[PDB]
Each structure stands twice: as C-alpha cells, then as structure tokens.
Amino acid sequence: MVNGKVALVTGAAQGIGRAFAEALLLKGAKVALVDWNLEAGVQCKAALDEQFEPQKTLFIQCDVADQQQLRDTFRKVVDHFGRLDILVNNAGVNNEKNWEKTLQINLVSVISGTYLGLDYMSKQNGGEGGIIINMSSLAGLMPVAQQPVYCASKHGIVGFTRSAALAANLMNSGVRLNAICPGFVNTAILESIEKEENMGQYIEYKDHIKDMIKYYGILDPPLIANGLITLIEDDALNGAIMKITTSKGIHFQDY
Amino acid sequence: MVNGKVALVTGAAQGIGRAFAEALLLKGAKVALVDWNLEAGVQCKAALDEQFEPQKTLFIQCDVADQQQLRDTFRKVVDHFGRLDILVNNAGVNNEKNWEKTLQINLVSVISGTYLGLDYMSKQNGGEGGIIINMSSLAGLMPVAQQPVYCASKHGIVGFTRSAALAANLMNSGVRLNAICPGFVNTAILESIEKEENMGQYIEYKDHIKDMIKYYGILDPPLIANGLITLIEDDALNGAIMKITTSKGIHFQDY
Ligand SMILES: NC(=O)C1=CN([C@@H]2O[C@H](COP(=O)(O)OP(=O)(O)OC[C@H]3O[C@@H](n4cnc5c(N)ncnc54)[C@H](O)[C@@H]3O)[C@@H](O)[C@H]2O)C=CC1
Ligand SMILES: NC(=O)C1=CN([C@@H]2O[C@H](COP(=O)(O)OP(=O)(O)OC[C@H]3O[C@@H](n4cnc5c(N)ncnc54)[C@H](O)[C@@H]3O)[C@@H](O)[C@H]2O)C=CC1
Ligand SMILES: Cn1ccc2cc(-c3cnc4ccc(C(=O)N5CCCCC5)cc4n3)ccc2c1=O
Ligand SMILES: Cn1ccc2cc(-c3cnc4ccc(C(=O)N5CCCCC5)cc4n3)ccc2c1=O
C-alpha cells in the first residue's frame, strides 16, 4: 500500500520526477517536490493542484548539491507532513564541461540524500522503515562513449545502492533500497546532448548517441512511473536493480 | 615497452604504488612519485635511490584532491623528464565517516588526473600516446556491505575507465585506458577496517569482511605490479578490466 504515506522526490518539477509525483499522488500519498528551479516547481505544483488535493503536495526550492540546504529541506519536509516513507532521488544533469558539478549532483547528492533518509527513516534512529529509490541509467550498467563522467556517476549510484541495501539489511533499519535504470526517456535532458555548452569536447561525437536512440527507442515517462509503483508495492525486493527498456520492458538485472 | 618512458604513478610512497614504482624502474622507466605524505615519500625515494639510479626517480608532494596542486604537479613532472608516457592513477583512502573526502580522493581525483593525462599525452594535441591505468578494486564490480561509498567510488572508476577507453579510441588520441581490480592485497589499508574513526557507523560489522579476507587469502603487491606490466606491454588492450585473485590469478572481466 501507498495510501497515507509521505513521499519525498528530488527534482520533481519536470520530466521523470513529476511523473513519479503524479503516480504517487494517484495512489494516494503526501508528496514533497524539492527542486532548485523556482518557476518550474511552482508551475508543476500549480498543475498538480488542479487534479489532486491542494494539501497533499509541498514544493521546496533547494539545491541538492548543497548539504546544509538538503538537511534543512529534510527538516521542513518532516516538520510539515510528519513522517517520511518513500524517498526518490532523481536530480541529474548532463554537463560534461563542468563535470565536477555533474559528479557532485548526480552521485554525491544521491549518497547524502540516502544517508539523510536513513537518518529520518531507520528504526534505529526512530521510525517505521520505508523505501529509498535511487535513479540511475543503463549507463550505470554499460559504457557510454560521449559522456564519461555521467557513466561514472551512474555506476557509482548503482554500486552504492546495491551495497547500502545489504548494509541496511544488516543494520535492521527496515529500509529497502532499490535502483531504477531507464533507457531513453522523452524529457528535456535529451536535448542537452545537442548543445556544446554542457557537452564540451564530445560535442563532435553526439551523432552516435542519436543513432543509438533511434535504434532502441524512446520511453514515455509514465511507464517509468510504473516501475516506481512496482518496487514500492513489493516488500520482498531489496537491492534489486530495475531495468526499463523498449523491447523487454520492466525487468531486473539478474546478478 | 617502457625502456625509456616516463611514468607518473600516484600514491607511490607505500603499498601497491611502491610496487608499481619498483617494477617500472626495474623495467627502465623514469618514475615521478606523487604523495601527500612527506616522510613516507622521502623514505620510499631514498630506498629507490639506494636500489635504482638516483636520476630515475622524482618525488613531488601533492594532494590529488586539490585541483590546483594536481595541475601544478603534472607541470613539474613534464618540466623535468620532458614527456609523459604512463599515468598510473592509484590513490585510495578508506574513510566512511568523512565519505565526502573519500569520494573526492577516489573518484573525482582519478577523473581529473585522467583528463590531465589526456591533455599532456593525446597524440592529436601535442603528444605521442601512452597508457593511463586507473587502479580500482574488485568491489568495483561486486557489492560490499560494510563500505558503500568505497564501492560507489570503485564502480565509478570502472565505468569511467570503460567509457573513456572508447572515447579516446574515438578521438584518435592514441591513449589507451585500462583498469585494475585486485582482490585483497596485503598493504597498510587493511588495518583501517578495524578503526571506528575510519569506518564510522560500519565498525560493528568489520567481522563480516574479515571473514571474507581470511577466506580468499591475501595478495602480494608484486603481483599487482606484474599485472601492471602485463597491461602496459600489450598494445591491443583498451578498456580491458584487470582482475587479480588468488585462485584464477591475472585474468580479464569478459563483458
Ligand atoms: N531522461 C532520460 O532519458 C534519462 C534520465 N535518467 C535520469 O533521470 C533523472 C531525471 O530525469 P531527466 O530526464 O534527467 O529529467 P529532467 O530533464 O527534468 O532533469 C531532472 C530535473 O531535476 C532537477 N534538478 C537537477 N539538478 C538539480 C539539483 N542539483 N538540485 C535540485 N534539483 C535538480 C531539475 O528540475 C531537472 O529538470 C536524472 O538523474 C537522469 O540521469 C535516467 C535514464 C535516462
Ligand atoms: N590494498 C588492498 O587490498 C586493495 C587496494 N586497492 C587499491 O589500492 C590503493 C591503496 O593502496 P595500498 O597499497 O592498498 O595501501 P595504502 O593505503 O598504503 O596506499 C595508498 C597510499 O596513497 C597515498 N595517498 C592517499 N591519498 C592521497 C592523496 N590525496 N594524495 C596523494 N597521495 C595519497 C598514501 O601514501 C597512501 O599510503 C587504492 O587505490 C585502493 O583502491 C585495491 C584493491 C584492494
Ligand atoms: C534492448 N536494449 C539494449 C540496449 C539498450 C541501451 C540503452 C542505453 C544505452 N546507452 C545509454 C547512455 C546514456 C543514457 C542516459 O542516461 N541518457 C541519454 C543522454 C542524455 C542523458 C540521459 C541512456 C542509455 N541507454 C537503451 C535501451 C537499450 C535497449 O532497449
Ligand atoms: C574467487 N574470488 C571470488 C570473489 C572475490 C572477492 C574479493 C573481494 C570482495 N570484496 C572486496 C571488498 C573490498 C575490497 C577492497 O578494495 N579493500 C578491502 C578493505 C579495505 C580497502 C581495500 C576488496 C574486495 N575483494 C576478493 C577475492 C575474490 C576471489 O578470489
């Protein structure tokens, strides 16, 4: 069940994040959208208000790269609603010129948010348990030539997820950690490859990514949401890596 | 071959780095030791001077985390031996309490050093070619419960190496990138898993990894040097993952 549970989704004003938020609110959940984009977040919240209830959503503007901001955002989330049951970490960028910030946002922020969610969720620290869902890509399971740091960040995310799952199992925290790896999703992050200001030296080789995209296909963000509702609804699923593609669909990386 | 080539090996004051430096100097290559430990580097340099020629070693104190020092160390290394031919990125600290520093030292520093090596080594830019070998662990392709962020860093190293190999093949830089994934190697980093000021919250489960170490045995740093020499000697090896264990031995991750 999801009804009555509090969900905290990072970067949920557009793309996959807002699809996750819509799915969670459809199943019934008080949802906190945190995002560093003020206008995008306000527009997303005002759109979600029209079909859902006004009081089941809460927008917070914060940069997940900052640590004090993330801690204070978690403080506001748990203060407003009251608890925390689902934590989805999907705030990624495709900047290769400033790859340091890309690594700080994709990987460091994921681990920091996971630790904060364990702080506010683990039974040892006081809580009932829950789920923490980390969003990686198939780049975390296979190499991508035109974006090395993004591949490294996704690999780090998947490794950290499938190790922290075993850790949390050992610590009796009651928190189950799973990772979601989509293929290509029709979002804005897909048009970033076409620009050199966040691609840099690899802007000359952006055609290979387009060829791969055409060969495989493009996934609707709603379908990705069906993955999130599938891991949450299953209690006996800890550390499993969800893979979403076109031909196969929603399956798992049998390790 | 490395009969007269120049190698920048990282973290060569002690442990695996010292074995790499000894092997390379035995083969005939000038070696630039880099370390953040003044005394540990000075003693290693004195020993290597007493063994090999005085002029084939150059010790430079630098913290690989600091970007300015790292780019101001490559400058002196290339301003001393003239060229750069081998780049061994080997600098890992196990510290889960300050996991931000661990991530910065293990993953960010390796990527920055690889980018500097491509800047100073790519055939199209001003160079001739060479090899960049990033040191990883078997935890780079397996989950480890008692150290999640270390697993994430190693997964990032593996993914970045695998992707950057294809990238460098695509840009015609002539630089070959490979990664090494040893098992348990008898060094001074295994004593850090028995320290609560170094492992933090996972110090109650160090027995689980100690059981694994006793089970798979331990490895001699000379074997990792043999693996490095095997990687460098073969010109048809780009992106191959180097696995060293005690039963199979030196072999490759067949992806
Ligand atoms: N869209 C795709 O085709 C794929 C995306 N993913 C992953 O899904 C995640 C999100 O999906 P996208 O398609 O990229 O959506 P997107 O284009 O909407 O980008 C994610 C959103 O997160 C927010 N965000 C970014 N950096 C942030 C930060 N530092 N602090 C707070 N909020 C921040 C922004 O609102 C941004 O629009 C990313 O981590 C991405 O790597 C996974 C596989 C493929
Ligand atoms: N020893 C083992 O059993 C395993 C080790 N490794 C890898 O080997 C490396 C560790 O070397 P070991 O010989 O095992 O032990 P070690 O800890 O003695 O070697 C690492 C050395 O690197 C240097 N170093 C650390 N941080 C630095 C920094 N920021 N700047 C400059 N120098 C720095 C220090 O001199 C340090 O002693 C790591 O890269 C680790 O991932 C891989 C698999 C298992
Ligand atoms: C059957 N099959 C087999 C292989 C396969 C591989 C991929 C596949 C392969 N490289 C990828 C590299 C990067 C990303 C990614 O995160 N991006 C894109 C760029 C913008 C940022 C967001 C996704 C990828 N996705 C997708 C589908 C299939 C597939 O359906
Ligand atoms: C046949 N076989 C099969 C599996 C296997 C697994 C490992 C194996 C399994 N977890 C590992 C986890 C971490 C590290 C590591 O980097 N540390 C240790 C801690 C201090 C920092 C440095 C190495 C590991 N090494 C080793 C050998 C075999 C092996 O020989």
Author numbering:
A (entry chain B), B (entry chain A): 2 to 256
Provide the publication's sentences verbatim.
We used cryo-EM to define the molecular interactions of SW222746-bound to 15-PGDH, which were interpreted from the structure determined with an average resolution of 2.9 Å. Specifically, as was the case with (+)-SW209415, SW222746 is fully encapsulated in the drug binding pocket with the α10-α12 lid of 15-PGDH closed around it. Similar to (+)-SW209415, the closing of the lid again appears to be orchestrated through π-stacking interactions coordinated through F185 and Y217 of 15-PGDH with the quinoxaline and quinoline-2(1H)- moieties, respectively, of SW222746. The amide carbonyl group of SW222746 replaces the (+)-SW209415 sulfoxide and maintains the specific recognition of the catalytic core of the enzyme through, again, a hydrogen bonding network formed with the critical S138 and Y151 residues. The piperidine moiety of SW222746 replaces the butyl chain of (+)-SW209415 to maintain hydrophobic interactions as well. For example, the thienopyridine of (+)-SW209415 reaches into the catalytic pocket to form a hydrogen bond (amine group at position 3) with Q148 of 15-PGDH, whereas SW222746 does not form any interactions with Q148. Additionally, the elongated quinoxaline and quinoline-2(1H)-one moiety of SW222746 form interactions with T246 within the β7 strand of 15-PGDH that is not observed for (+)-SW209415 binding to the protein, and interactions with Y217 are stronger for SW222746 than for (+)-SW209415.
The enzyme 15-prostaglandin dehydrogenase (15-PGDH) is a key negative regulator of tissue stem cell activity in proliferation and in the repair of tissue injury, whose negative regulation of tissue regeneration is conserved across multiple organs. 15-PGDH acts via its NAD+-dependent enzymatic activity of oxidizing and degrading prostaglandin E2 (PGE2), and related eicosanoids, which provide key trophic support for stem cells in multiple tissues. Specifically, 15-PGDH catalyzes the rate-limiting step to initiate PGE2 degradation by oxidizing the 15-hydroxyl moiety of PGE2 to a 15-keto group, thereby inactivating PGE2 from being able to bind to its receptors. 15-PGDH assembled as a homodimer, which is the proposed physiological form of the enzyme.
